[PDB]
Design a protein around this ligand. Structure first.
Ligand SMILES: O=C(O)CNC(=O)[C@H](CS)NC(=O)CCC(=O)C(=O)O
Ligand SMILES: O=C(O)CNC(=O)[C@H](CS)NC(=O)CCC(=O)C(=O)O
Ligand SMILES: C[As](C)(=O)[O-]
Ligand SMILES: C[As](C)(=O)[O-]
Lengths: 292, 299
């Protein structure tokens, strides 16, 4: 049994305020003896519009640098290792701008105990959706789509496949990650209210059952304060309900609905249980690759 | 508003008795103005073992011919059309036998108002599983299919067909949608343990993944598999001579909402109805155009 921490937070437009919350949650995860802590999509910031996102993304490389140092500081101060999986934004590359693409990158970072960035997964599927009884969102206006399938990470919990929010809606991605050797899948998200109440738990449980993997789901929660009285002169609401799901689709950890804002949930991952399930229903020996 | 009927029943090893139940359910569906009726996997029979299955599959063609005739009779007698989707077994062909394959075919039939068979879908993924808290191995008695089922232009809209365990392989449902499906059916004989766990989850998930209406006809109850004449012939003792099914038949919309569900407080056969709305399906697809956003450059 290995210990995982899944964080639930509420990003603002303020990167310093967010970093403080992120640092405390990681510190809390170390004390509760988790080997990896998982934090939601857009943990660095959420923005009012495409232009505000481009503005804040410029501050993101600094945010990341300070995060890396905080991890090494906390590892040393606590006398135990931890790895960090976190959703951030990134500015366009120098090539990207000359190439005529001035959009930010929605990225999931994996940072080991040495503060070393092991993976930068850029979101493949972008949220361009007219939410029924909800907002009209077009992620592709401010965000550039990723170019590659992310590698399996040999994590302290085991083999990890990573994805971001809307990626969860495309089963072929999760299936491919299992084919590559995933034992654990993560879906850090800033999930809307209306789709969240409809599909969050459903999709999380389905992907766990479909792939026979543990599924980790860090989610943003509540109404986001996008207030920026520096950018405004000189709406977003997230579902929360962060959870951990076993390879049989059972919820084994869930966020406390009462407590407002930042919280941490804990679960112990069992490799024997995972192997038992895959042995009893060997789906990966039963696919019809000849046809599909 | 196109009306579908989904049937829940409890198959025995007696094809004559099973046919009677099926005829009554189709008759009821016509009276209730259903345009298509969907019946479960193995509506012709369930068997005690792989040998029993092969013995019984020999009676299946006669079951099917009589069913075809009943359909045209009922259509005539009610002056109203209905199509029928029903799971049966079929014996192996001469070619199968020539190749050393004497296993039966687990087949989903689509039969039209004229008694004409438009599709025989042979199940692709066979249930070979250690059920947590009876070991089942479908491939001992059943040969896997080799074809992807065509989309059927049904009275309700474009139909994709699948059988039970097929539901666990999302790429199959995704393919049906890619080929133009608006409705998916998963006629089934699902175990209690896996039904409790995953029946509702997988039905709803497939609905949401594909943005299709999902139809879920299920076997229910403890099956009576006794066949004294076969038991005599194969020389079985009492000790030599179990199946129980989940039921919970349902109709799910493209957003994942259960809109029709079997009544738990009735034993044996029952019919559920739902009026399907193509406009709801189109609206959902327009607002979240998943099939315009897939990454086929990578998958
Ligand atoms: O805007 C940013 O900066 C980061 N991107 C997000 O927060 C996006 C929306 S634009 N959230 C999702 O895709 C969640 C998926 C979801 O809600 C569903 O699949 O139903
Ligand atoms: O023996 C026969 O005649 C065939 N009858 C069946 O009921 C078959 C295989 S034994 N059932 C399933 O595949 C149900 C799937 C299921 O229960 C799951 O996906 O967990
Ligand atoms: C390497 As595998 C058992 O996830 O197909
Ligand atoms: C259902 As038949 C015996 O006509 O193939």
């Amino acid at each position: 049994l290995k210990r995982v921490a899944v964080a639930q937070l509420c990003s603002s437009a303020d990167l310093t305020k967010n970093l403080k919350v992120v640092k405390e949650l990681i510190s809390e995860a170390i004390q509760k003896k988790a080997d990896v802590v998982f934090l939601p999509e857009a943990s660095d910031y959420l923005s009012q519009n495409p232009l505000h996102s481009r503005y804040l993304a410029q501050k993101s490389p600094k945010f990341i640098r300070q995060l890396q140092s905080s991890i090494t500081d906390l590892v040393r101060d606590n006398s135990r290792n931890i790895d960090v999986s976190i959703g951030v934004h990134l500015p366009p590359s120098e090539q990207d701008l000359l190439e005529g693409n001035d959009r930010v990158r929605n990225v999931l970072l994996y940072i080991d105990h040495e503060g070393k960035i092991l993976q930068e997964y850029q979101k493949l599927h972008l949220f361009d959706v007219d939410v029924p009884n909800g907002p009209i969102l077009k992620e592709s206006k401010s965000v550039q789509p990723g170019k590659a399938i992310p590698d399996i990470i040999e994590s302290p919990l085991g083999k990890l496949g990573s994805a971001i929010s809307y990626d969860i809606r495309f089963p072929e991605f999760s299936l491919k990650l299992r084919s590559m050797g995933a034992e654990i899948l993560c879906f850090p998200s800033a999930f809307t209210i209306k789709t969240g109440e409809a599909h969050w738990e459903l999709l999380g449980r389905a992907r766990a059952v479909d792939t026979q993997c543990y599924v980790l789901m860090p989610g943003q929660v509540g109404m986001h304060d996008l207030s920026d009285p520096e950018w405004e002169k000189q709406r977003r609401e997230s579902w929360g309900h962060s959870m951990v799901i076993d390879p049989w689709g059972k919820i084994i950890a869930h966020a406390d609905p009462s407590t407002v804002g930042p919280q941490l949930i804990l679960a112990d991952l069992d490799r024997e249980l995972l192997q038992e399930i895959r042995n009893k229903m060997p789906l990966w020996n039963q696919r019809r690759d000849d046809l599909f």
